Design a protein around this ligand. Structure first.
Ligand SMILES: CC(/C=C/C(=O)NO)=C\[C@@H](C)C(=O)c1ccc(N(C)C)cc1
Ligand SMILES: [Cl-]
Ligand SMILES: [Cl-]
Ligand SMILES: [Cl-]
Ligand SMILES: [Cl-]
Ligand SMILES: [Cl-]
Ligand code: NA
Ligand code: NA
Ligand SMILES: [Zn+2]
Length: 360
């Protein structure tokens, strides 16, 4: 049997930042603070250190267009004004001369963990990477992302490791619309995102972030959006969503690999997410996901902007990956009415496609 929890972190993840705002939320301190807490908590030393690698062109082209890859590669040589001009053509993006290099190692870090997990060298793993990936699209940056780390990893697992079915779970407080678009017509990848939505008033402000977007073509039924329409959701809301919606579908889908867009902007204290999820909740969510795919689970960091809250969320997830007993949840409680309304609506939209959801 596979044993061990992999961790990838390289100093290159700190070597890019916003050139026009020294206080930009997507900053090197996000990942260095995580690493400092993993060490203080004694968790870092229990992990198997896994080297990062740079993604190749062929791997990027599993998801991205050649023209976009070439444009991103060219940012290495642009001036600060050239970088600002290009970044402002995208939605919520900054650029930096080291962004491309770091983005290539960010992708490659996930591919390394996929290698170790799919060949049973490790049970599971976590990349402590930036830049994030889940908003990046075939031919554009978006939302602090250049390359779609997990979408590339999913297609890489299929091509290199002969995986038939991949589940991608996006618990970052934002909708990973890039992942949705990439796998829209693909029944071999099931994408589930829970995200703040507020009827479109919360970024990215897309109608396709609602639960009516279920996939298309052969992929119909394999895209599952759970939008929250009120702020302040707690652990009981996320636990209910996983138990009543995600896990029934996951056990029916029978994935061979689970990839997690592991953002921590839904954690208590995040300045953007507006949710009240205890970090300890992520130990429970991680635990639930270990039950499918024979525990083959790879997490990659997405968002999360309160340095302490994000570090605590990573630590809680890591404790589960390492096999530590699940925590007692402090502010635990039944789901609220608004969460039940959203869960019910998504179930009603996905009901025709999944027999496990037909409990009424
Ligand atoms: C993209 C994103 C988070 C993504 C994430 O977490 N993906 O999962 C947040 C946006 C709304 C944001 O907060 C922002 C802040 C400042 C800014 N400028 C100063 C121009 C532009 C955008
Ligand atoms: Cl910029
Ligand atoms: Cl290997
Ligand atoms: Cl396990
Ligand atoms: Cl709680
Ligand atoms: Cl309520
Ligand atoms: Na999400
Ligand atoms: Na799909
Ligand atoms: Zn986010």
């Amino acid at each position: 049997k596979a044993t061990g929890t992999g961790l990838v972190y390289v100093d290159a993840f700190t070597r890019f930042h916003c050139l026009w705002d020294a206080s930009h939320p997507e900053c090197p301190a996000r990942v260095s603070t995580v690493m400092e807490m993993l060490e203080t908590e004694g968790l870092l030393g229990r992990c198997v250190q896994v080297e990062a690698r740079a993604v190749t062109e062929d791997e990027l082209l599993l998801v991205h267009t050649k023209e976009y890859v070439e444009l991103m590669k060219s940012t290495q040589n642009m001036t600060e004004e050239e970088l600002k001009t290009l970044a402002e053509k995208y939605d919520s993006v900054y650029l930096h001369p080291g962004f491309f290099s770091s983005a290539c190692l960010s992708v490659g870090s996930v591919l390394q963990l996929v290698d170790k997990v799919m060949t049973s060298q490790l049970r599971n793993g976590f990349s402590i990477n930036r830049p994030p990936g889940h908003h990046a699209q075939a031919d554009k940056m978006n939302g602090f992302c250049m390359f779609n780390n997990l979408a590339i990893a999913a297609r890489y697992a299929q091509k290199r490791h002969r995986v038939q079915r991949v589940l991608i779970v996006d618990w970052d407080v934002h909708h990973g619309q890039g992942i949705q678009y990439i796998f829209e017509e693909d029944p071999s990848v099931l994408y589930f995102s829970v995200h703040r939505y507020e009827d479109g008033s919360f970024w990215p402000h897309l109608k396709e972030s609602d639960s009516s977007s279920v996939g298309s073509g052969a992929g119909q039924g394999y895209n599952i959006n759970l939008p929250w329409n009120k702020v302040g959701m707690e652990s009981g809301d996320y636990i209910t969503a996983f138990q009543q919606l995600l896990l029934p579908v996951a056990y029916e889908f029978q994935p061979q690999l689970v990839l997690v867009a592991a953002g921590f902007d839904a954690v208590i204290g995040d300045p953007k997410g507006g949710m009240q999820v205890s970090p300890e909740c992520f130990s429970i969510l991680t635990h639930m996901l270990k039950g499918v795919a024979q525990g083959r689970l790879v997490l990659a960091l997405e968002g999360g902007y309160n340095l302490q809250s994000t570090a605590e969320g990573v630590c809680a997830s890591m404790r589960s990956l390492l096999g530590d007993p699940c925590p007692h949840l402090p502010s635990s409680g039944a789901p609220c009415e608004s969460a039940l309304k959203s869960i019910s609506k998504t179930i009603s939209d996905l009901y025709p496609f999944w027999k496990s959801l037909q409990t009424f």
